[PDB]
Amino acid sequence: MKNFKISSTYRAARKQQKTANRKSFYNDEGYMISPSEWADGVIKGLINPKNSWSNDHVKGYLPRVSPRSHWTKNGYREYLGIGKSRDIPEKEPEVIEMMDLELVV
RNA sequence: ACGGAAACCUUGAUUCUAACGCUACUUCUAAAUAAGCGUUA
């Protein structure tokens, strides 16, 4: 994930909805566990501490992610993925002949 | 040195002929190999 970054609106929403203050923890099978047993499993090695917790939920359907920018050769700004998005029109499509087909109104 | 001696209750005979442990009965009834994708970036 390099073309996009975390949006500032979502970061502000998460910050002052305090969703990181209400984390949920999981064991290696992805089942909700109390923070005490999560700590005990992480210390024992039975849980990977990295991918085993969630930052609650942010409400309001905000865009989580915004395009990231970089510097072109002349010092102008540009979106990272705008210019290397595509080069060929992928050929396609295929026009299948299906004149014998009863459509439904 | 006896109402005593001698004398097979014996011979020949198939407990045999005929007869289906048989008639009827669905291993049957419902059921998508399918559901969840969070949070961080």
CB A56 within 8 Å of CB A62: no
Residue nearest to nucleotide B36 (CA to C1'): A30
Cited resolution, angstroms? 2.7
User: Which residues, including other chains, have CB under 8 Å from residue A26's CB and lie 6 or more apart?
Assistant: A32, A33, A38, A47, A52, A53, A54
Query: How many Å apart are CA A73 and CA A80, to the nearest integer?
Result: 13
- Alpha-carbon gap, residue A24 to A35, rounded angstroms: 8
Stated in angstroms, how far is A43 CA from B16 C1'? Answer: 98
DSSP structure class, residue A9: H
CB A57 within 8 A of CB A20: no
Instruction: Please tell me the experimental approach by which this structure was elucidated.
Output: cryo-EM
DSSP string, A26-86: E-TTS-EE-HHHHHHHHHHTSS-STTSEE-----S----EEE-EEE-TTS-EEETTTSSS-
Residue with tokens 């029109």: A89
Q: Which nucleotide is nearest to A11 (CA to C1')?
A: B40
